[PDB]
Amino acid sequence: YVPPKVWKWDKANGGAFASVNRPVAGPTSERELPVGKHPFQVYSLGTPNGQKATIMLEELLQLGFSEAEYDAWLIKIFEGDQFTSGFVDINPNSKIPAMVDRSGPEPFRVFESGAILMHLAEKFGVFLPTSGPARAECLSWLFWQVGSAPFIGGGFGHFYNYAPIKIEYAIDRYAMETKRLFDVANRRLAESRYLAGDEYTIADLATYTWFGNIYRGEAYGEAATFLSMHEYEHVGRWVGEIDARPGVLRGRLVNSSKGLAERHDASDFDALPPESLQAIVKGF
Amino acid sequence: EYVPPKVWKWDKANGGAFASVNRPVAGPTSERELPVGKHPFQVYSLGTPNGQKATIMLEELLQLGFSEAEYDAWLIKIFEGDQFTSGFVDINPNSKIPAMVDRSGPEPFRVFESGAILMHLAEKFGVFLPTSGPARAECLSWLFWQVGSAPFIGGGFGHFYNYAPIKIEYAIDRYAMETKRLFDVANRRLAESRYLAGDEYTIADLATYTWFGNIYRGEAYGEAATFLSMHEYEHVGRWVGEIDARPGVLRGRLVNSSKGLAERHDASDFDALPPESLQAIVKGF
Ligand SMILES: N[C@@H](CCC(=O)N[C@@H](CS)C(=O)NCC(=O)O)C(=O)O
Ligand SMILES: N[C@@H](CCC(=O)N[C@@H](CS)C(=O)NCC(=O)O)C(=O)O
Ligand SMILES: N[C@@H](CCC(=O)N[C@@H](CS)C(=O)NCC(=O)O)C(=O)O
Ligand SMILES: N[C@@H](CCC(=O)N[C@@H](CS)C(=O)NCC(=O)O)C(=O)O
Numbered sequence: 363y364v365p366p367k368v369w370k371w372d373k374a375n376g377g378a379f380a381s382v383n384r385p386v387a388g389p390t391s392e393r394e395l396p397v398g399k400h401p402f403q404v405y406s407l408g409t410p411n412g413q414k415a416t417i418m419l420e421e422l423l424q425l426g427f428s429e430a431e432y433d434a435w436l437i438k439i440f441e442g443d444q445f446t447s448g449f450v451d452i453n454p455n456s457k458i459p460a461m462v463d464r465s466g467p468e469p470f471r472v473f474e475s476g477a478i479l480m481h482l483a484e485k486f487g488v489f490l491p492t493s494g495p496a497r498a499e500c501l502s503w504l505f506w507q508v509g510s511a512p513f514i515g516g517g518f519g520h521f522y523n524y525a526p527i528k529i530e531y532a533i534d535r536y537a538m539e540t541k542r543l544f545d546v547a548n549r550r551l552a553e554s555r556y557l558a559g560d561e562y563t564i565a566d567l568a569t570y571t572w573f574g575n576i577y578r579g580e581a582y583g584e585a586a587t588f589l590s591m592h593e594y595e596h597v598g599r600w601v602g603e604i605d606a607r608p609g610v611l612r613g614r615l616v617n618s619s620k621g622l623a624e625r626h627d628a629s630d631f632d633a634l635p636p637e638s639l640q641a642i643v644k645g646f
Numbered sequence: 647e648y649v650p651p652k653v654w655k656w657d658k659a660n661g662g663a664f665a666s667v668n669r670p671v672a673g674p675t676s677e678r679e680l681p682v683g684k685h686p687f688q689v690y691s692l693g694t695p696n697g698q699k700a701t702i703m704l705e706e707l708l709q710l711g712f713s714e715a716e717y718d719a720w721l722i723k724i725f726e727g728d729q730f731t732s733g734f735v736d737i738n739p740n741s742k743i744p745a746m747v748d749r750s751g752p753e754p755f756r757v758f759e760s761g762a763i764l765m766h767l768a769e770k771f772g773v774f775l776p777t778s779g780p781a782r783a784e785c786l787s788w789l790f791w792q793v794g795s796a797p798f799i800g801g802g803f804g805h806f807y808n809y810a811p812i813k814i815e816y817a818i819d820r821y822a823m824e825t826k827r828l829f830d831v832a833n834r835r836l837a838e839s840r841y842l843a844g845d846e847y848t849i850a851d852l853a854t855y856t857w858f859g860n861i862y863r864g865e866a867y868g869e870a871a872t873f874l875s876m877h878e879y880e881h882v883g884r885w886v887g888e889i890d891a892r893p894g895v896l897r898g899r900l901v902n903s904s905k906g907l908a909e910r911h912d913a914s915d916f917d918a919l920p921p922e923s924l925q926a927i928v929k930g931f
Binding site for chain 1 (some may be wrong): 647648649650651652653654656658660661668669670671672673739740748753755756757758759760761762765766780783784786787789790791793794795796797798801802805806807810811812813814815816817818819820822823824826827828830831834835869872873874875
């Protein structure tokens with residue numbers, strides 16, 4: 363194989379995502395989004411990125427902020443729901459999560475999980491230092507997470523778990539980088555309880571959804587063995603602490619095949635068996 | 647066909663040119679302190695698109711008269727492992743450029759990641775980022791979009807098309823397709839808006855412009871502009887052309903660059919270059 367002078371879209375690419383991945387953006391059909399009664403309207407799926415948004419909102423509800431009540435509407439990314447006119451209008455990039463803030467007289471969109479986390483942390487004044495050097499430390503780790511997850515999911519996850527052919531050079535490239543990123547976190551968590559200081563912030567939440575899912579064996583087949591996750595004992599400590607947070611236990615279940623399809627009221631969780639909200643096990 | 651082992655082992659080089667630095671472990675590999683100059687901001691960087699975000703931002707602030715944005719930009723040679731000295735790891739645990747130390751107050755502190763540097767500076771000086779209101783959310787959305795998507799352009803497309811030792815059709819196709827999709831996102835936005843997050847230039851534009859302009863104008867990744875049909879993105883081209891004319895862009899692009907200044911330690915340093923370099927875009931080597 364020799365790359366052509368001009369790339370053309372003529373072959374399938376993406377494995378399980380080959381029915382949605384395209385070289386062009388924009389909507390593929392006309393459909394409006396549903397709107398509920400609560401101030402925050404979230405359009406998402408319970409992947410690590412969706413979980414950032416729904417955990418953040420559940421964290422705010424644990425603190426008593428009624429302005430954080432939310433409707434979490436299901437977006438099925440294997441089905442192309444991210445390409446409806448209504449979804450593209452709230453996220454031009456056609457990825458979950460995306461949100462509409464309806465808490466004021468004029469609604470507006472917020473897209474990208476990092477922007478959603480920042481927006482909510484700034485609105486309520488929690489989980490992000492409002493000023494001082496600690497703010498810069500938190501932002502540094504949050505942007506680090508956003509800039510590095512593509513290597514873990516779009517790189518390692520894709521080539522290890524979804525690509526139709528196993529490609530040694532690509533698997534090696536992204537397995538190596540994923541381990542390096544876990545080592546960055548592990549070395550930080552050897553010296554600090556949380557990534558950006560002594561307290562849990564949005565930088566921890568953002569990293570945790572990805573790292574905990576991989577570390578505890580729930581993501582990408584046998585990846586936890588493949589990547590020698592046992593090496594990262596400080597990551598493990600921090601995953602265990604965050605796993606225990608009530609807002610994490612609730613938020614991780616939203617838009618999830620193992621939890622709630624959607625969330626429209628706090629009482630929706632009463633439909634689940636009590637075991638679904640109990641401690642995330644660590645052993646085998 | 648290849649069969650992955652049960653447990654991954656680091657048994658083969660990976661990275662092409664970058665195989666002399668890419669590792670599955672983090673942390674410092676030598677003890678060396680960072681140099682420190684006289685100015686309030688100390689930047690440790692290289693004039694890649696990500697380094698240019700930092701140096702352009704500082705030059706934009708100096709363009710507005712903010713003397714508190716004066717800076718030393720020290721060169722970090724990423725092919726040679728300068729990013730793994732103890733001094734550099736101390737300011738960026740992730741060992742990537744740009745990173746900086748804010749020495750403007752009584753206690754210095756690190757800021758790492760280009761997006762965090764842009765936000766830190768925009769918040770400090772109250773410019774290039776709406777301080778409140780729905781426009782702030784729009785700006786942050788586009789800025790995080792840039793940071794979350796550049797890995798597909800550089801770590802995906804650029805790597806497989808330009809650096810990997812073997813041309814891998816599936817990987818080149820995956821990331822060429824995604825790079826084009828991201829250009830199309832920007833192109834469709836810029837068809838309806840002068841800038842990404844509204845009518846005015848913000849840090850979201852600066853962050854995206856360094857990458858998109860370098861690819862679009864033909865200076866990144868060999869023949870990528872022809873390969874990716876850059877001529878298709880006329881609104882990206884219009885926006886690149888507008889940002890190209892800003893003096894802070896023209897100066898900041900030249901910092902830590904093999905076609906500009908190796909380092910910046912004072913505003914007069916630019917008088918070492920041909921004067922035309924400050925007046926029109928210079929394409930990198
Ligand atoms: N940088 C983005 C990444 C979001 C992302 O990868 N979303 C995925 C699910 S986790 C998605 O919606 N993919 C749809 C698609 O690629 O078509 C963020 O942090 O929100
Ligand atoms: N178009 C995407 C569809 C899959 C997708 O969006 N995956 C998510 C995780 S479910 C991902 O890798 N997100 C990267 C990030 O968060 O930056 C692809 O082909 O990789
Ligand atoms: N998300 C990071 C990406 C920074 C990045 O990719 N830095 C590259 C040069 S542009 C680097 O220093 N690479 C060194 C290495 O990989 O060893 C940011 O926006 O700052
Ligand atoms: N370790 C890196 C070294 C090269 C590198 O860091 N490249 C930069 C551009 S020079 C990149 O793609 N950064 C991704 C980003 O900005 O998110 C690799 O092999 O990809």
